[PDB]
């Protein structure tokens, strides 16, 4: 699950730190600068058929 | 509110022209004559202070560009010099800039009991010019062994570069500061 702040803003900052640690390469992230200039993801998709549910 | 960057305002902006004067050109020539002609940049401080006195106690961005043209360097160097040194006012100070709050050696004898009385007397915060445009409050650079702790520095910009005077007043009472300010308002200058 992807969480968001209580204000309604998504917490993901497109740091790709989860994509680099994923031992199964199940995460693909695409990011760009939003209209406000904030670092956010455009595409964040997880392969649940590659996921090994390790919690890394 | 000392900021290391400039926001364009009606008071100061690069579009406004700024030459020195007819009377101040001889001073510029004399200042430049002290250094070799290939090292005109060495006369940036004695020219910046002259611009500060002439303009009225503060340096608009136009004055810095004029000084840069006179010494023939990039204006960023003059900005670097102006922002580094603490005697160059980049915000608009009052006609009689008053320097009050002390330093380390001078507060042992009680130099931190003088700013608030004047601040509430003239009724505008530090770095804020009064409505009539006469007085301002700033932080002094204590100069000596400071035997008499309550010292106030009075920078005078009433007559420009011809009547600019920088005095230190020793042992001034938190009400004697009001006395000397009232004397300054009329026009008379107190002795030291």
């Amino acid at each position: 699950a992807l969480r968001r702040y209580p204000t309604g803003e998504e917490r993901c900052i497109a740091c790709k730190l989860c994509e680099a640690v994923c031992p199964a390469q199940a995460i693909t992230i695409e990011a760009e600068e939003r209209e406000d200039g904030s670092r956010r993801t455009t595409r964040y998709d997880i392969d649940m058929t590659k996921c090994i549910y390790c919690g890394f | 509110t000392a900021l290391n960057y400039h926001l364009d305002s009606p008071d100061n902006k690069p579009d406004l022209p700024w030459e020195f004067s007819e009377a101040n050109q001889s001073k510029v020539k004399e200042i430049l004559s002290y250094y070799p002609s290939n090292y005109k940049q060495s006369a940036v401080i004695p020219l910046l202070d002259l611009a500060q006195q002439q303009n009225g106690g503060w340096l608009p961005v136009s004055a810095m560009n004029a000084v840069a043209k006179v010494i023939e360097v990039a204006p960023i160097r003059v900005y670097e010099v102006a922002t580094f040194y603490s005697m160059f006012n980049r915000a608009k100070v009052g006609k009689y800039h008053l320097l009050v709050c002390g330093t380390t050696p001078c507060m042992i004898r009680g130099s931190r009991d003088i700013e608030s009385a004047l601040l509430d007397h003239l009724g505008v915060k530090r770095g804020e010019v009064t409505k009539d445009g006469l007085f301002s409050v700033g932080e002094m650079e204590c100069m000596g062994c400071c035997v008499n702790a309550p010292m106030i520095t009075v920078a005078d910009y009433s007559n420009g570069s011809e009547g600019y005077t920088y005095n230190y007043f020793e042992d001034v009472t938190p009400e004697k500061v009001v006395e000397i300010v009232e004397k300054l308002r009329k026009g008379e200058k107190p002795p030291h």
Binding site: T28, E30, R43, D45 | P36, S37, N38, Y39
Partner: protein
């Protein structure tokens, strides 16, 4: 090329006629460290990739997509050349560009301009 090892290795004959580039990767411009230098790599020029028309993933049909970047590394140009020669790959060698250490002194920041010349 005596690509006998290529014949007794198991690589398919289609991939044994590839053209590769032997080169030493240079230091990145965003870092001043020189730790990832001195190693030689074989570039298979594997550019045939496309986009998956279901999720936008990068698809490929080239087995040598990342072998030369991931596992195949050599400590010298001679080792890479011998490897390519034994595997029967047509190779070209790109000699690395190396910096030249010039004389630089701190006192050069403060150098006399010379006597004022009214030229």
């Amino acid at each position: 090329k005596r690509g006998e090892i290529g014949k007794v290795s198991g690589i398919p004959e289609e991939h044994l006629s590839r053209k590769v580039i032997i080169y030493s990767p240079a230091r990145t411009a965003t870092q001043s460290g020189s730790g990832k230098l001195g190693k030689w790599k074989i570039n298979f020029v594997s550019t045939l990739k496309w986009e998956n028309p279901l999720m936008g993933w990068t698809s490929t049909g080239d087995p040598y997509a990342n072998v030369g970047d991931s596992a195949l590394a050599f400590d010298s140009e001679e080792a890479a050349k011998s490897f390519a020669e034994r595997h029967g790959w047509d190779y070209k060698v790109k000699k690395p560009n190396t910096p030249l250490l010039k004389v630089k002194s701190y006192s050069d920041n403060f150098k006399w301009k010379g006597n004022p010349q009214p030229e």
